Amino acid sequence: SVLEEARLRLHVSAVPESLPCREQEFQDIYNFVESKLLDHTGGCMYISGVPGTGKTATVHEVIRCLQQAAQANDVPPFQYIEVNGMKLTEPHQVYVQILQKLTGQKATANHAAELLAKQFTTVLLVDELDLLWTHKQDIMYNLFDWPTHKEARLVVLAIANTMDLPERIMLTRMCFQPYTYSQLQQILRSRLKHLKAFEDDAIQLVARKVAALSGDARRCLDICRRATEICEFSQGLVTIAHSMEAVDEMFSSSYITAIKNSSVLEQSFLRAILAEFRRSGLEEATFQQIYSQHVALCRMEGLPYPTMSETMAVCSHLGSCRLLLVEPSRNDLLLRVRLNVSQDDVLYALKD
Amino acid sequence: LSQVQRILRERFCRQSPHSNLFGVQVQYKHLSELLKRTALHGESNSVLIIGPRGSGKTMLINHALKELMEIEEVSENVLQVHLNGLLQINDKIALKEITRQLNLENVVGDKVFGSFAENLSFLLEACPVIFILDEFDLFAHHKNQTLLYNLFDISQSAQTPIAVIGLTCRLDILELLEKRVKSRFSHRQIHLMNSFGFPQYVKIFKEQLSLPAEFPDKVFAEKWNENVQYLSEDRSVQEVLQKHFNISKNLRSLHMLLMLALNRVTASHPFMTAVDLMEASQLCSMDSKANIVHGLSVLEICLIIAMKHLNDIYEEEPFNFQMVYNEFQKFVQRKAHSVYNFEKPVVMKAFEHLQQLELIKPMERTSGNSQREYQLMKLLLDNTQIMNALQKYPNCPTDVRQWATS
Amino acid sequence: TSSMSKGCFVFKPNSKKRKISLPIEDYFNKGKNEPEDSKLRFETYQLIWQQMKSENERLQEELNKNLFDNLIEFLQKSHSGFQKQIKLREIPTAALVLGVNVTDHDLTFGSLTEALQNNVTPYVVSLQAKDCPDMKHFLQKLISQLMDCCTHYSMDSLSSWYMTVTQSPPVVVILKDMESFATKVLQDFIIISSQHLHEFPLILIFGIATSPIIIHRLLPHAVSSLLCIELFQCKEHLTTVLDKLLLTTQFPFKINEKVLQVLTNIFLYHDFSVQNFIKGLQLSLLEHFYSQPLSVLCCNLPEAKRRINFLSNNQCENIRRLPSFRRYVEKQASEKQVALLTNERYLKEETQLLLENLHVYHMNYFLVLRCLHKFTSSLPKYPLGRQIRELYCTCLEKNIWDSEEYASVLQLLRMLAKDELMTILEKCFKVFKSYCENHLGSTAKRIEEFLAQFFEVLRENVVNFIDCLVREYLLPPETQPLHEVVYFSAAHALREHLNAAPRIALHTALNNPYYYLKNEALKSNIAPDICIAYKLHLINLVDWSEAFATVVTAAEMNEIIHARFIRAVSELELLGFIKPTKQKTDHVARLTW
Amino acid sequence: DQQTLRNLLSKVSPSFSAELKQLNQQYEKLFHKWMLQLHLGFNIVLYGLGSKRDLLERFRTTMLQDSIHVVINGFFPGISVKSVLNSITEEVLDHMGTFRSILDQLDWIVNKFKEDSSLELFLLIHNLDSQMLRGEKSQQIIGQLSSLHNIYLIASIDHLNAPLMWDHAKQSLFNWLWYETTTYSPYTEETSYENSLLVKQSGSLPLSSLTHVLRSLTPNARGIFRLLIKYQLDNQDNPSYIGLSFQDFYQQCREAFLVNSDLTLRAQLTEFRDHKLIRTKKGTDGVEYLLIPVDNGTLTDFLEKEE
Amino acid sequence: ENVVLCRESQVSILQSLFGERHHFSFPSIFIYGHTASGKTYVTQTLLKTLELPHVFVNCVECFTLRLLLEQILNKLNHLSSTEITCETFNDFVRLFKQVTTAENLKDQTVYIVLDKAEYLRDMEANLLPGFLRLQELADRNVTVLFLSEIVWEKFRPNTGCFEPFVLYFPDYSIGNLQKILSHDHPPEYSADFYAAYINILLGVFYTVCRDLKELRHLAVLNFPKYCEPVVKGEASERDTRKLWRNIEPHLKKAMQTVYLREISSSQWEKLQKDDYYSKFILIAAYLASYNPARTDKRFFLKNHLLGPKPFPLDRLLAILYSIVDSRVAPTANIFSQITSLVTLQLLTLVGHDDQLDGPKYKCTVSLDFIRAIARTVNFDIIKYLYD
Ligand SMILES: [Mg+2]
Ligand SMILES: [Mg+2]
Ligand SMILES: [Mg+2]
């Protein structure tokens, strides 16, 4: 049909061969690698940024176009090694993984460290540097200082989420920036070239909202494909109402509607909490005072007189679903109770 | 009869697939066509089903997988793996279960992989696969949440179609995730609040204990459905139904209430009665603490009245054994002249009996650092429970009540 | 050597290969009086202290085995309940309270292990609180010792071992340090073992160092109701060791009243310790053999009398100068003074007759005292004393009839029933039978017809019989001549060696330096710098600095009177008098006396 | 005044010189009597007003020449019982090695003296009431040393109320015999004059003054200073990367339930700086050090003995 | 052999909920009760009576998870008929699905009874939710029983669980206790005589004790005392007044001695078959600790609530010289004797600031212990503590 191809292009696994809006970073990283692969010298680079920036696809484009150059006899041929930091069980296994990738030998962690030491053309990539932290803090310090040698002839590209880690460790620094309005609009238009499946104002509203909150492309493609599903329900063209339903489906906090659908005694429990705060003025309170106000509230409403075990079941039911913040229940009648949500959200939920 | 007990005990306790779904039409509709996109096509999606305890999450997922499983082509080439948050508490327990339940344990054998992701990638390459994660919130309390990343990454990036469905009681589930696993997680939320009122709940009560139409003896089923039709409009049933609806809107409490009602039907009493449901509701709503206070001795009650007067005069300040004993001595020496003039270590043993049952707690628990006396304790009862349980005591003397009022 | 910036400088005799050391007798002797006398007396000292040490070790061994016997019999009674289906039986425990000290508890429990291993069980084990923090370690070590006496081990795994080897004896667990165990481990071990006791019998030995209330504090009533407790346990040890050391005629040396009055007043006042009573006697027997050269005679009579025959003239002169002998010779007849002092051969031969007169006074004294103990303990009021050590002090101090104490003792003993006297004389006859070689064999006969008589006239005789016995035989030992060769009375020297007092001594030197600096320094100002700072104190530092200056100059530019004041404050602070405070520059008076 | 100025000012002379002179030979007479009692299983500790250092020094010249004897300076600020047992094991005994615990060292020494009586050791202690040897564990080790027959001991006490350390069980170990030696020799060697009224202070703080200034303190402040000690100790293994950081210190202290606000930590650092405990090197281009200059082995000894 | 008395409604409810073998029952029933109301007895006799294949496992025995799971697995394996080892809850459930498919166990309700279940909530966090949902996880018609002393509201973890039907066993009344005790009767006398003894024993011990086990143990020990008037001949079976007059003082004395377990039962049955300065230091420390410092000069020279108050040693020696009417020298031994009492735990040093110049001691001893020592040396503590 029409929207089936829209879902095929909008799915995130269909990465384009050329990503729009990050051409200067591709050129910068390409010239950085080209200046050191040609002369057989080594260095190091640190990249970071929020997870919605597009670092993996861009570095894959850089690596790919270097194999395209290397097959054309432009640059000296190089072996590619890759490790991802998140995907390993214990942090020492990066050494033995590079050892398996480079030569046929397999060993333990410290023996891999020693053979890496005695051995040190290749281009290493280390994504997700954050989990190689130890209290000994040896691993990343190795990962920077091995290429700074004559025998190394290798380059290391490090990727993370916070630019304030290389200092604590005690290097060229690049920064992937959060996305704006126009770049997100251009990439949504670039994935939708030869298809008349959307009117442009839906793209406008979704791009403006995701640039308002976070600025990630994964949110963009998820909201737009969910709106494509919403268009599949209402049977075309995806109007503004479908995207407006999608965004307050997947971005709104459902705490107030969780309050509103509950039973009478749970809302009376929250009334007892707010009435006790208005009598006191603090932000935490014992179960005894909430129970004391709740007996008076149940007397005034006309509900039958509640026992401590029944209201305790009520309080445990709220505490399981994190609408309150409560201690483990092994002590009783002296649970200090505090809200997780603001007071005005609760007062808006109970007025209707 | 035997068969009505068999079918209704299959309905309530071992919660069984029954075709009726209540007020979840939009949610079941969306989840069902989404599973058909993942089933017939190569689309890969991720949803957490979010709702409180006992609101029908396992029912929804089992009904949807069964109704999907009826279709032949998805029946041939879909393998299911069910994981619960209570069994697998480590990334290794989880890995072992996923390699076992796909029946590639002979395929793996002695092979050693570099990484967790290499293991899962070698596993899945030997066809759509559906993953179901009961109790998703305890996978957010591991060391690194490596399982959650290695599920969402292969869902979102890998060509192998993966469906990941989550079940969770914590409403703040997008606040315990790390930022990166949040970034690859599509925020598709399906909310099963108990979105129904009291007449709908009366219809639930009517429908849930009505025999099916595949029962062999038809006339007994007709008379039984007419009987529960009659009990649906009875006001005595609706008063306890209104009370237990006021406590909660969960249907598992209704299942327990109906099971405690069904327990009292025999061949001697062939049809249910309103007083049966009244007895079941009285059995469910007993209060524990006053019941424990009912089973105490007279000296125990005198200690608790003395400790109540300590918490009324010395207002939220802790206490030890000796102040309690001097208050009790003040009761015996003037009011109960010569009555209950017990010695010191018997009152000590009665105090230790109270501690044993955990009605009195230490504010600071330091075992052996100080002796038994001069150690600060707090009362774990309300005054109104003490008055209520004292009014229901089997043989309570006049003077202990006269002290209890004054 | 000793002043450099480290705290361990050790001299070794290197570069001189002469490792021959100094003799111990060369360190003991120091004078030119008699050397060979001083090297035979200390072989005598060594032999007597070997006899003392052997006598003490045996005394204690008897008392120890006596206690273990009471434990063995109890262990056979409670297993009879297992011999006769758990019927909710309890676990027997025995509370074996030892002494205050912990160092000898290794030897006490070592003797208990071999006592139980022969009599009750072939399986007995001991457990330690150091190596049992939790139940998993506690149950790990317990199966390791039972298996040697013959993997997540359990109490169920314990009982399967019991049917492996028995296919009847109990197993005994010795908790030697019950106070040191954790509270959680002891509560859990009782409950797990009580449910499986009918196929695994249990008997527990607890080591209670403190008062036995410590069972209740660690173990609550909910857990201690599953156990049946029995208690198993100074003054009785003291009167035992006095009678088999001092009162025996077996051993030659004695001690005086004031040596004894020191050694009893340290025991029953401060600490009920029999071991420092031995510490007193090893000093008291020491200073006798060193100070007096004629201590070589203090032996058994065959060895003593041969030593008189071979003596130096100086040592014979020392016998001539014995103050007991000077009063012997003055009352002696007019021909006999010139016989002894001029002739060393007459002087020697007089001694063996005097030494044997002295030695038979050792045998006639105590058998009267043991007999007099039997009348006095049978008396109800206990006037002179209730124990053998209280009669011995009050008789040796002065003649007891010379005091008015014995007059009331005779008055009470005169009026008694016949069966009481028949009870006493049965005891009094077997005391005579207990000790042979009697030189009061005549009085051994006389009480036997007094026994054979069994009314007002006849019971007056036997009361007068013991009354005439105490006049004839019991006398203070100073009356007999040549007593000092076997006696030692250095009272205040013995007092100064043990219970000395520093807080008198530091207070003494500061207030009155005229005691120890006899150069007319004080009669009721001319004082050293340490003392001046003390008396003026009995307080800000600058007023104390000024008033120190007017005193030291009244006895006399000056800057040293503040420099003297700096040392007099600083040494007074190393001592526990002054501690700096924040109200003034300083304000402290913690001596307060 | 200065401490070095007071050591240089040594021109004073004793007034009663001849009167105090006769109080050396009088107590020199009792040397052989002391030798006779000690050799047979006793111990002697001397109680008096002035310093007994010169009397025991005269005792070691006149009597203890042809013997294997060791002298302990308890008045030395760096003294410990582990030091004296290691000294005996390495110098008196010919063993060369390291031992797991000092209780096993006490057991090894006792076991060695059971098998052989040919060794005799004269154990000389100039002061036993000094701050470092006051603990009941230390004198428990000493009492288990003292009870044997091949070990002979001499000691002194100075404090007004000295025997609050040894009890009935401990004086069963120590076979005390007591003697009056109340000379008026001044405590020239034993008064180190540190932390006195004299304002002059020399070098880093020794162990005793460090414990004395840190025990009269808030326990949260003690925890803060122990955090500083362990952090400087884990940095001082190598001369590079030494240096704490105020912001890192605030992060580490606020990670615990120790401090609420940064101004309270500023008050803490000024409270340490008034006693010259912290050395503030903040503002340095490399790192804002904020380290402590106390000797690191003394710091390990303080942290291991703080409770 | 086994009879249960005054448990008729609860037994009927249990057998109604258990139903037939092929029926499906609850996943969890939780039972709370008092310290002895036949929580173990009723369910264990009732699972022996109907022949339901069941495993009875104590939790206090199983202080680790591995012991608990291997114990339940081996007991159910013996019910089927080498050794079964599982380390995790996952392998427990997998091998439980492996083992229960035997021919006897296919279509009946398997029971796992866990008594003393209050030691599970300290074990791990994931174990109690693991057993509360066992029917849904394993799918093999399995019912789980919980026996405890603590109410269910103290058992809930933070994240909520499958709620059981909570079940209550009532306390025994005086009539029910009388009827239980008068069943296992002594054959050599009449039952009415033994019932009169149970009646007078409940007339003595009901006010303090409602517990079954202690009351039966007291009846067992004090029965040989009761039957001596009829053996000797002064009384007979019908003279109830003489028996009560003879026996009341014995049981009134037995509460202070036997019930507190000061004197053990063996010595009680054997008795019925057989018919210096440390004293003053411990006065000085207790007068220092329990007395304010501002009143020190009035009592010596011329509360018991809230615990002790620490005192200095300078005050301690100042007290000690004022009571003892003699010249007492501050020797080696008297300072050596104070530090013996701290080794006996009668006194305690507080603060640990310094050793010799730390005066801070604390007096951990009761009032009555001092009053016995003071009577020995004939001294009045009452005049000196307070007015
Ligand atoms: Mg990435
Ligand atoms: Mg579920
Ligand atoms: Mg039980």
Curated annotation (Swiss-Prot), chain A:
One of its GO terms (cellular component) is nuclear origin of replication recognition complex. ATP binds at residues 15, 49-57, 128, 161, 218. It is found in: Nucleus. Mg(2+) binds at residues 127-128. The keyword Aminoacyl-tRNA synthetase does not apply. Residues 16-352 are annotated as: Necessary and sufficient for ORC complex assembly. Signal peptide: none annotated. GO terms for biological process: DNA replication initiation; mitotic DNA replication checkpoint signaling. Component of ORC, a complex composed of at least 6 subunits: ORC1, ORC2, ORC3, ORC4, ORC5 and ORC6. ORC is regulated in a cell-cycle dependent manner. It is sequentially assembled at the exit from anaphase of mitosis and disassembled as cells enter S phase. Interacts with CDC6 and KAT7/HBO1. Interacts with LRWD1 predominantly during the G1 phase and with less affinity during mitosis, when phosphorylated. The BAH domain mediates binding to dimethylated histone H4 'Lys-20' (H4K20me2), which is enriched at replication origins. This is Origin recognition complex subunit 1. It comes from Homo sapiens. The lineage of its organism: Eukaryota, Metazoa, Chordata, Craniata, Vertebrata. The chain holds residues 486 to 860 of 861 of the full protein.
From Swiss-Prot, chain C:
The modification Phosphoserine is found at residue 21. Keywords: Chromosome, DNA replication, DNA-binding, Nucleus, Phosphoprotein, Ubl conjugation. It comes from the Eukaryota. The keyword DNA-binding applies. InterPro entries: ORC3, ORC3_ins, ORC3_N, ORC_WH_C. One of its GO terms (molecular function) is DNA replication origin binding. Pfam families: ORC3_ins, ORC3_N, ORC_WH_C. GO terms for biological process: DNA replication; DNA replication initiation; glial cell proliferation; neural precursor cell proliferation; regulation of DNA replication. Its main location: nucleus. It is found in: Nucleus; Chromosome. Multi-mono-ubiquitinated by OBI1; ubiquitination is important for efficient DNA replication origin site activation. Ubiquitination levels are low in mitotic and early G1-phAse cells and are induced in late G1-/early S-phase, peaking in S-phase and decrease toward the end of the cell cycle. Component of the origin recognition complex (ORC) that binds origins of replication. DNA-binding is ATP-dependent. The specific DNA sequences that define origins of replication have not been identified yet. ORC is required to assemble the pre-replication complex necessary to initiate DNA replication. Binds histone H3 and H4 trimethylation marks H3K9me3, H3K27me3 and H4K20me3. Belongs to the ORC3 family. This is Origin recognition complex subunit 3. It comes from Homo sapiens (Human).
UniProtKB/Swiss-Prot annotation, chain D:
It is found in: Nucleus. Component of the origin recognition complex (ORC) that binds origins of replication. DNA-binding is ATP-dependent. The specific DNA sequences that define origins of replication have not been identified yet. ORC is required to assemble the pre-replication complex necessary to initiate DNA replication. Binds histone H3 and H4 trimethylation marks H3K9me3, H3K20me3 and H4K27me3. Stabilizes LRWD1, by protecting it from ubiquitin-mediated proteasomal degradation. Also stabilizes ORC3. Component of ORC, a complex composed of at least 6 subunits: ORC1, ORC2, ORC3, ORC4, ORC5 and ORC6. ORC is regulated in a cell-cycle dependent manner. It is sequentially assembled at the exit from anaphase of mitosis and disassembled as cells enter S phase. Interacts with DBF4. Interacts with MCM10. Interacts with LRWD1 throughout the cell cycle; this interaction, which occurs only with non-ubiquitinated form of LRWD1, prevents LRWD1 ubiquitination and hence stabilizes the protein. Interacts with POLQ. This is Origin recognition complex subunit 2. Keywords: DNA replication, Nucleus, Phosphoprotein. It comes from the Eukaryota. Belongs to the ORC2 family. One of its GO terms (cellular component) is nuclear origin of replication recognition complex. Transmembrane segments: none annotated. The modification Phosphoserine is found at residue 13. The keyword Amino-acid biosynthesis does not apply. One of its GO terms (biological process) is negative regulation of transcription by RNA polymerase II. The chain holds residues 268 to 574 of 577 of the full protein. Its main location: nucleus.
UniProtKB/Swiss-Prot annotation, chain E:
InterPro entries: AAA_16 (IPR041664), ORC5 (IPR020796), ORC5_C (IPR047088), ORC5_lid (IPR048866), P-loop_NTPase (IPR027417). It comes from Homo sapiens (Human). Multi-mono-ubiquitinated by OBI1; ubiquitination is important for efficient DNA replication origin site activation. Ubiquitination levels are low in mitotic and early G1-phAse cells and are induced in late G1-/early S-phase, peaking in S-phase and decrease toward the end of the cell cycle. GO terms for cellular component: chromatin; chromosome, telomeric region; cytosol; nuclear origin of replication recognition complex; nucleoplasm; nucleus; origin recognition complex. Belongs to the ORC5 family. Component of the origin recognition complex (ORC) that binds origins of replication. DNA-binding is ATP-dependent. The specific DNA sequences that define origins of replication have not been identified yet. ORC is required to assemble the pre-replication complex necessary to initiate DNA replication. Component of ORC, a complex composed of at least 6 subunits: ORC1, ORC2, ORC3, ORC4, ORC5 and ORC6. ORC is regulated in a cell-cycle dependent manner. It is sequentially assembled at the exit from anaphase of mitosis and disassembled as cells enter S phase. This is Origin recognition complex subunit 5. Coiled coil: none annotated.
